[PDB]
Amino acid sequence: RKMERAEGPASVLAIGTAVPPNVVYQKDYPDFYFGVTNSNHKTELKDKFQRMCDKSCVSKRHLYLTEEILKANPSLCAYWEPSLDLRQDIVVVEVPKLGKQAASAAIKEWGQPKSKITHLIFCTTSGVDMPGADWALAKLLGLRSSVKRLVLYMQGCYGGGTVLRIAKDLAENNKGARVLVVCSEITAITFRGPSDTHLDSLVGQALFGDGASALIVGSDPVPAVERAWFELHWTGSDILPNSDGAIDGHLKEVGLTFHLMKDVPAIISKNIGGILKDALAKVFPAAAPPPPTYNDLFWITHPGGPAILDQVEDRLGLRKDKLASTRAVLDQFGNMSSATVLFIMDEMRKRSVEQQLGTTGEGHEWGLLLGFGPGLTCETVVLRSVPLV
Amino acid sequence: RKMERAEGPASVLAIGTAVPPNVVYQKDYPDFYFGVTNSNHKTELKDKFQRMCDKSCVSKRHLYLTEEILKANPSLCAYWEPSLDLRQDIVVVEVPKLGKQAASAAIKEWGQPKSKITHLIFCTTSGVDMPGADWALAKLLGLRSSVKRLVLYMQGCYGGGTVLRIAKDLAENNKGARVLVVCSEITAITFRGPSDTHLDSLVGQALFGDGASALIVGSDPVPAVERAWFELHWTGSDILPNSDGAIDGHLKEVGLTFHLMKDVPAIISKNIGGILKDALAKVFPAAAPPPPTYNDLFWITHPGGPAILDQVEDRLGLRKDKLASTRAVLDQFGNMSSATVLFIMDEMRKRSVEQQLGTTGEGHEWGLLLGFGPGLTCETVVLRSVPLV
Ligand SMILES: O=C1C[C@@H](c2ccccc2)Oc2cc(O)cc(O)c21
Numbered sequence: 218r219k220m221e222r223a224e225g226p227a228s229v230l231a232i233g234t235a236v237p238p239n240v241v242y243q244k245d246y247p248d249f250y251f252g253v254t255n256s257n258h259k260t261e262l263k264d265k266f267q268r269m270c271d272k273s274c275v276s277k278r279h280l281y282l283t284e285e286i287l288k289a290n291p292s293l294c295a296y297w298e299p300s301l302d303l304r305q306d307i308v309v310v311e312v313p314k315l316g317k318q319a320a321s322a323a324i325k326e327w328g329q330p331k332s333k334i335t336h337l338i339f340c341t342t343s344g345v346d347m348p349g350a351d352w353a354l355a356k357l358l359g360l361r362s363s364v365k366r367l368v369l370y371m372q373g374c375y376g377g378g379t380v381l382r383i384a385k386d387l388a389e390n391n392k393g394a395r396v397l398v399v400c401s402e403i404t405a406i407t408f409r410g411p412s413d414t415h416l417d418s419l420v421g422q423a424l425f426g427d428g429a430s431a432l433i434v435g436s437d438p439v440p441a442v443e444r445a446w447f448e449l450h451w452t453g454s455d456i457l458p459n460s461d462g463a464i465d466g467h468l469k470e471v472g473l474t475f476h477l478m479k480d481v482p483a484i485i486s487k488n489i490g491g492i493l494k495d496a497l498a499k500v501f502p503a504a505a506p507p508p509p510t511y512n513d514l515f516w517i518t519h520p521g522g523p524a525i526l527d528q529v530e531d532r533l534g535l536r537k538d539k540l541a542s543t544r545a546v547l548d549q550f551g552n553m554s555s556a557t558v559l560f561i562m563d564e565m566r567k568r569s570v571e572q573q574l575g576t577t578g579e580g581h582e583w584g585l586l587l588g589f590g591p592g593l594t595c596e597t598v599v600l601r602s603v604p605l606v
Numbered sequence: 607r608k609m610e611r612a613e614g615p616a617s618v619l620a621i622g623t624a625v626p627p628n629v630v631y632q633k634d635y636p637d638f639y640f641g642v643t644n645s646n647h648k649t650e651l652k653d654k655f656q657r658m659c660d661k662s663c664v665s666k667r668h669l670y671l672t673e674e675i676l677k678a679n680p681s682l683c684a685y686w687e688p689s690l691d692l693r694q695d696i697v698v699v700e701v702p703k704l705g706k707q708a709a710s711a712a713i714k715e716w717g718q719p720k721s722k723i724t725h726l727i728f729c730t731t732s733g734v735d736m737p738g739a740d741w742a743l744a745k746l747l748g749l750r751s752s753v754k755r756l757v758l759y760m761q762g763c764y765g766g767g768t769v770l771r772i773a774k775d776l777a778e779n780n781k782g783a784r785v786l787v788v789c790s791e792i793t794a795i796t797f798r799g800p801s802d803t804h805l806d807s808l809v810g811q812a813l814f815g816d817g818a819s820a821l822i823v824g825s826d827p828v829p830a831v832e833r834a835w836f837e838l839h840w841t842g843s844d845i846l847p848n849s850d851g852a853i854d855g856h857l858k859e860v861g862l863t864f865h866l867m868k869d870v871p872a873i874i875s876k877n878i879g880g881i882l883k884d885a886l887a888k889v890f891p892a893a894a895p896p897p898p899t900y901n902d903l904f905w906i907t908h909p910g911g912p913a914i915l916d917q918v919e920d921r922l923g924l925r926k927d928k929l930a931s932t933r934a935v936l937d938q939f940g941n942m943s944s945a946t947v948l949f950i951m952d953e954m955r956k957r958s959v960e961q962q963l964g965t966t967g968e969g970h971e972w973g974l975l976l977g978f979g980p981g982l983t984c985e986t987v988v989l990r991s992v993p994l995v
């Protein structure tokens with residue numbers, strides 16, 4: 218008559234990542250991009266893109282689309298021409314396949330048999346289908362036929378916080394539950410040619426890359442058997458003021474299109490302080506601890522772009538090293554939408570181990586994961602690190 | 607450092623429904639359908655459709671598409687011609703608007719101010735967008751900017767069980783949480799003309815209707831203030847054996863397309879017994895109660911079609927009155943995909959009140975809600991009724 222619930226906080230027990238093999242260096246991208254799109258006569262357009270690549274703080278990105286793949290399918294190299302069936306027929310298979318790579322890495326690391334996975338959350342902004350990427354991934358992995366699945370489509374760059382917000386309740390309210398969390402994104406859904414009044418779509422071409430990340434999330438890790446890396450303690454979601462239409466994304470016959478109608482860095486950086494301050498007030502209330510200072514937290518922040526990071530760092534007065542893990546991931550894979558915060562989480566724990574810092578969170582006990590996306594939606598997750606050795 | 611959890615079982619505290627005003631009687635539909643599609647010369651095709659309307663056990667359905675709306679947009683009356691941008695530009699506004707109708711009915715009934723809603727789950731098979739129908743609905747309703755939202759897109763006919771499975775954990779693991787659950791479906795996403803090798807799409811034209819349903823789901827109802835109607839006690843999800851490709855749905859440039867590659871009624875009815883028997887074994891284990899007989903449970907079953915209902919009823923040996931509430935909803939609105947089980951739940955409690963039966967579940971204590979869809983996915987929710995007067 219009942220389902221027993223768990224007792225301890227939803228914990229990240231393993232993380233895996235995966236990227237397409239093809240690497241595109243940002244030094245090379247304005248040439249590759251304008252070359253493969255038959256558009257170098259667009260000398261004016263070409264050079265402000267050159268300038269945004271220069272200021273993108275992305276060094277390289279992994280992309281599924283090859284010179285040869287774009288060679289063979291002209292309608293993506295073209296611009297604003299019917300393309301949805303071709304991208305979907307790519308993305309509906311390549312997105313779950315990339316996610317299966319990350320998932321196998323997480324499961325191996327976790328060390329338990331794949332049949333102990335009781336739930337799956339699959340999150341993507343690239344492609345839609347029925348049955349969905351969740352079912353395609355379960356088929357690829359051979360999960361038990363009764364895993365409870367959830368596919369979160371058309372999320373955007375806040376989706377990495379969204380999957381943690383949901384996984385927390387699945388893990389905490391079901392005794393023994395082990396949640397596979399996968400975020401997988403592939404840029405074939407939005408890749409277009411350049412144009413001189415699609416300069417929203419231009420910024421996309423400078424920052425968006427491909428990748429997938431996977432977590433195992435569970436409460437009450439089996440002692441000496443399973444290993445927790447971060448604990449999910451508090452979540453919050455917010456629609457920022459005066460941000461209507463800031464970030465829109467439409468799934469159209471020409472594919473997925475991308476729109477910025479507001480100064481997204483100003484909106485986030487102006488309002489982020491009040492959000493964090495309230496969240497920490499809830500986690501550390503007077504009635505007891507004072508909340509740690511911003512510099513004494515670890516920061517897992519979605520790098521929508523350099524201008525967001527710089528203005529957040531400026532408005533909150535963060536010491537210049539706090540966004541280091543965030544910036545390293547953007548530099549080496551660019552903006553991978555919902556998957557990005559989980560690459561950052563993985564990078565942060567790996568350095569902490571490698572450099573023998575005191576905790577999985579760079580030596581700090583508490584931290585914040587932030588996702589931003591259409592809405593303008595901001596997802597806040599207060600995390601706790603776990604001590605090392 | 608914490609989020610308090612709730613103590614009692616996630617309970618349905620209110621239900622509202624809504625349908626487009628335009629009513630189409632099944633007696634009239636083969637003429638209306640073939641008339642508005644320029645296809646009555648298709649005398650052969652026309653008459654087996656006549657036959658499936660005859661055997662559809664649907665009397666009427668509410669549809670957003672009018673004779674005049676189809677008059678004004680020829681590409682939907684046509685068949686298999688570019689149509690996705692037009693349907694989406696319809697559905698991305700009409701689906702949240704229909705859902706806002708049902709939501710306001712649920713909230714009024716609930717009686718608490720709309721700002722006490724802390725979470726939203728919006729489920730639909732009709733349209734996708736960013737920001738999503740969840741955000742569009744929150745905007746229409748004026749919910750607090752910090753409601754935690756979740757949009758479940760491209761679910762299909764099992765989605766009504768899916769939203770309960772998720773809402774259960776949100777309500778139960780967050781003290782004070784009140785979840786708005788909305789399922790909204792509008793058939794403009796799939797409406798096509800007829801063809802003589804699109805006879806999957808033909809069955810769709812006989813059974814699919816429009817509608818939206820909304821729930822308020824919360825744990826620990828405030829005594830004498832809030833009223834519970836059903837309690838969610840156990841959930842389970844299953845991919846039925848040998849059902850690969852049974853039910854596929856693709857979002858294409860011509861719109862959303864619908865495919866049956868297996869005998870869906872045989873697959874469900876052959877395997878449903880083992881699922882129910884296992885579920886009840888878990889809810890009522892020996893260690894104590896024996897599980898109630900099938901005839902002593904109330905049944906809230908998704909009416910994919912008459913052939914599913916009849917073979918389930920036959921293979922499980924259910925007395926002929928058990929699927930009565932289910933069949934009444936299919937008769938008066940047809941298959942409304944994810945919303946249908948919640949119309950049935952609403953119909954069942956309303957009769958129980960009207961006829962002064964002992965419980966919200968027709969006088970029975972325990973019941974089953976079943977959703978079926980692509981996968982072949984079966985969602986099982988063991989519910990408990992609440993006693994009346
Ligand atoms: O336009 C899309 C692009 C998409 C993506 C990026 C990388 C790989 C696949 C897909 O991410 C987004 C995030 C948003 O917050 C808004 C968007 O409109 C998009």
Ligand SMILES: O=C1C[C@@H](c2ccccc2)Oc2cc(O)cc(O)c21
Pocket residue numbers: 347731732761762763764791792793794795796814815816853854855856862863864865941942943978979980
């Ligand atoms: O083809 C769609 C139709 C959709 C619907 C019905 C009514 C109103 C809007 C949308 O419901 C479905 C359920 C499925 O299990 C599989 C499907 O392929 C569909």
